[PDB]
Write a protein that binds this ligand. Structure first.
Ligand code: HEM
Length: 152
C-alpha cells in the first residue's frame, strides 16, 4: 500500500479542516473511543476515573491529551507515508510502556473516521473516507511491524 497523490490530497484537505479545532476533535475522538471500546479507557490511568460522557467532556486533562495525540497524528499524515522517524518513538512507547494492542489502534482509527464524518460531511465523502482509511491502515501496518520487532 502506497497512497496516490490524489488520495493524499483528500486526506490532507480534510486534515486542514480538523486543524481549525484540534481540541474539539481530540475530545470527540477519545470520547467515541472510550464509549465504543471501554477496554481502551482502562489503558489510561489518567482517565479511568471518568465514568460518564459528561465527565469526559468536562475533563480539561482529557482535552489536553486529545490535542497531544492529534498533533502527533497530523505530523505523521503530513509526511505522506515518509514517517519512519515519527513512528519509531510512538511504536516504542505504545508497545512497551502503554501496552496498546494493535487492535486498539484499529478502534482509534474507527473513532477518527467517525468524528471526521460528523464534523466535515462536505469534505469527507466516500472518496475522502476511503483515502483516510488507507492512510490510517498504512500507519497501523507500520506500527505493527515495529511491534513485531519488539516482540509485541
Ligand atoms: C492514532 C493513534 C495514536 C496516536 C497518534 C497517539 C499519540 C500519543 C502521543 C503523542 C502520546 C504522548 C507521547 C508518548 O507517550 O508516546 C501518547 C500517549 C499515550 N497513548 Fe497514545 N496515540 C495513539 C493511540 C493510542 C491508543 C489507541 C491508546 C489506548 C487505547 C493509547 C494510549 C496512550 C497512553 C496510555 C498514553 C500515555 C498517556 C499518559 O498517561 O499521559 N494511544 N499517545
Amino acid at each position: 500500500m502506497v497512497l496516490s497523490e490524489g488520495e493524499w490530497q483528500l486526506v490532507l484537505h480534510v486534515w486542514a479542516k480538523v486543524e481549525a479545532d484540534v481540541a474539539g476533535h481530540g475530545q470527540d475522538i477519545l470520547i467515541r473511543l472510550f464509549k465504543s471500546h471501554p477496554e481502551t479507557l482502562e489503558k489510561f490511568d489518567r482517565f479511568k476515573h471518568l465514568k460518564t460522557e459528561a465527565e469526559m467532556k468536562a475533563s480539561e486533562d482529557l482535552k489536553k491529551h486529545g490535542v497531544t495525540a492529534l498533533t502527533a497524528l497530523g505530523a505523521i499524515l503530513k509526511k505522506k507515508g515518509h514517517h519512519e522517524a515519527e513512528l519509531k518513538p510512538l511504536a516504542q512507547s505504545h508497545a512497551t510502556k502503554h501496552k496498546i494492542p494493535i487492535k486498539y489502534l484499529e478502534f482509534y482509527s474507527e473513532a477518527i473516521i467517525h468524528v471526521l464524518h460528523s464534523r466535515h460531511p462536505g469534505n469527507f465523502g466516500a472518496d475522502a473516507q476511503g483515502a483516510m482509511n488507507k492512510a490510517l491502515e498504512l500507519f497501523r501496518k507500520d506500527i505493527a511491524a515495529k511491534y513485531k520487532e519488539l516482540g509485541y
